Structure formats: structure tokens, C-alpha cells
Amino acid sequence: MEEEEVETFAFQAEIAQLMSLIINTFYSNKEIFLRELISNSSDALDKIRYESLTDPSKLDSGKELHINLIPNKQDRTLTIVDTGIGMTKADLINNLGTIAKSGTKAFMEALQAGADISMIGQFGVGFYSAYLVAEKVTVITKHNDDEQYAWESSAGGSFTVRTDTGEPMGRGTKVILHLKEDQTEYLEERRIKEIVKKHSQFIGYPITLFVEK
Ligand SMILES: Nc1ncnc2c1ncn2[C@@H]1O[C@H](COP(=O)(O)OP(=O)(O)O)[C@@H](O)[C@H]1O
Ligand SMILES: [Mg+2]
């Protein structure tokens, strides 16, 4: 019989406001969520790549540097996996919700004046575009310094973090998007290919799309 510890965190006030704004307003051009998550994996892959030329053993639990897109039409999930640097516990809590982001207020002002959600990345809050298409997001991550953790949120002002006792990943981050009922086009291979081609073609790392069938 298992016992697992969970910790519940409140999103920083403006992050929570941004989150509600994302979820509760209609926005065209939602497909940009994919560009934001892939840029995040590309950034984490640059990170491990550079860290390793200083200390090669950092590639022990993780040699290949790439991105995998995994739609699941049974689960209604869309998973973006990278073999990037990953996140420590502190990186998860601070980076994903707890600490104020300096661009937050500016972006909301931008949006309320009619800006395209596409501008989100320039404001340092690109991760949150995930909520344009997903009702719940799960982040599984593994950094060399630590154990694997699972971050999770359905918005509402809180997120949870717990040590993951699930499939081990070695090193990297996996963003699992539990898609809203009406956002299932993001599970289709043709559309995923369309949006990567439109928005994500200068990634310095190979991206593979895995289609169940
Ligand atoms: N796939 C990932 N791998 C590692 N860290 C990540 C990943 N996705 C997000 N992060 C962390 O979350 C932070 C917030 O991401 P985001 O909201 O996109 O803003 P930005 O990329 O401009 O900093 C990143 O700066 C990074 O530290
Ligand atoms: Mg980003």
C-alpha cells in the first residue's frame, strides 16, 4: 500500500489572472500553443547541450537531444516530450507558477486592448498558452540533480507538485495536455504537421511525431 506526498500551491496573483483570461476569453489563432511549448523544449535542450561541454557526465542519463509529439486520441491528450535539462523541484515551483513574471501585467494590458494571443511568448509567459487548448496540464520532469516530479493544474488558482512514481524518463520534460472537448484537431497528424511547419521550423533539434495506428 502506497503513501505519496503532494503539495498544493497558489499561482502568483497575476499569473492566476492571466490564466483565467486565457481560459475564459475567445481567441482565434490558438494553434500558437504548440510553438510556445516547442520553444520551451528547444531552450531546455540548448541548456543541457551547453552544460555537457563543461561536464559530459551530464549526458549519462540522456544522450539524444530531441523532441517528440505524441497525440493520443483515446486519452484526448497531446504530449510534448523533450530530453532537455528538465526541472528540479525548486525550478518547477518557482518557474511554473509561484514567482511573479515581469511581463505579466503588460501582456494582459496588451490582450485587453486587442492583441493577438500569439504575442504571449514575447512576454515571458508562453507556457500558459497551453491553457488555450487544455483543461488540465501535467508536467513530468527529471533534472540530473534530482528525482522525477509531476506538476499539475486545471487552473482555478492552484497547482500541485509531487514526486512522480510513474514511468521514469531519464532526463527531460514531458508536457501532457488534456485537451478541451472542442480542441481535438490538435490530435490530428495533418494539423500537427501543419502548425509545426507554419510556426516551428527553425528548431535546432529533431522533432518526431508519433501517430498511434
Ligand atoms: N520543457 C521545459 N523544460 C525545462 N524547463 C521548462 C520547460 N518548459 C518550461 N520550462 C521552464 O518554465 C519557464 C517558464 O516558461 P514560459 O512561460 O514559456 O516562459 P519563458 O520561456 O519566456 O521563460 C521557463 O523559463 C523554464 O525555466
Ligand atoms: Mg517560453
Side-chain angles (χ1 to χ4, degrees):
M1 149 153 181
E2 297 249 308
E3 203 215 58
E4 306 195 12
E5 172 183 75
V6 186
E7 304 173 54
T8 309
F9 300 83
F11 278 109
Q12 187 268 343
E14 293 88 51
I15 295 314
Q17 290 171 42
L18 164 50
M19 285 185 76
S20 309
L21 227 203
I22 285 163
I23 302 167
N24 292 290
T25 306
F26 177 84
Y27 296 113
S28 281
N29 208 21
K30 288 174 167 86
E31 63 192 51
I32 72 74
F33 83 81
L34 211 215
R35 179 196 71 210
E36 288 314 314
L37 310 174
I38 290 169
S39 304
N40 288 348
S41 302
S42 174
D43 293 344
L45 283 164
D46 283 352
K47 283 174 183 67
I48 189 67
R49 178 175 74 163
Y50 282 89
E51 218 160 309
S52 73
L53 43 65
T54 298
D55 300 297
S57 82
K58 302 173 80 148
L59 256 257
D60 282 5
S61 207
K63 268 210 167 63
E64 303 182 8
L65 296 189
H66 56 342
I67 298 169
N68 289 349
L69 306 180
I70 313 173
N72 187 326
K73 285 286 200 171
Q74 289 71 239
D75 250 25
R76 258 179 42 214
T77 64
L78 182 52
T79 294
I80 300 72
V81 183
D82 68 60
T83 54
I85 191 161
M87 294 180 266
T88 59
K89 188 182 181 189
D91 289 342
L92 254 188
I93 301 166
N94 288 327
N95 290 351
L96 291 186
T98 257
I99 245 77
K101 289 296 185 280
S102 73
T104 319
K105 292 193 174 192
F107 188 49
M108 296 195 291
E109 280 194 9
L111 277 187
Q112 278 170 144
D116 198 280
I117 16 91
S118 179
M119 300 304 293
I120 198 171
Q122 295 181 100
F123 291 78
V125 289
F127 166 86
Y128 303 102
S129 57
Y131 289 80
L132 281 164
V133 306
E135 59 195 6
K136 175 170 77 191
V137 175
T138 312
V139 184
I140 310 291
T141 197
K142 175 60 177 72
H143 180 106
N144 281 328
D145 307 337
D146 220 326
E147 49 237 13
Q148 190 155 308
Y149 300 100
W151 171 112
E152 189 168 82
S153 181
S154 299
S158 294
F159 67 93
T160 62
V161 168
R162 70 194 68 196
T163 58
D164 189 16
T165 52
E167 207 136 321
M169 60 180 329
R171 180 201 68 255
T173 300
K174 201 193 324 164
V175 176
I176 318 172
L177 307 171
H178 300 89
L179 301 179
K180 288 154 180 180
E181 48 157 31
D182 70 341
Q183 297 299 317
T184 64
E185 63 194 81
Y186 300 106
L187 301 170
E188 296 299 337
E189 54 267 51
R190 178 194 303 298
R191 181 96 170 109
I192 293 160
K193 284 195 302 193
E194 179 175 44
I195 72 181
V196 167
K197 197 77 160 89
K198 177 168 292 187
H199 300 97
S200 305
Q201 49 178 114
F202 318 125
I203 307 301
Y205 301 99
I207 309 179
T208 309
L209 173 64
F210 295 93
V211 180
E212 171 75 29
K213 232 36 216 59

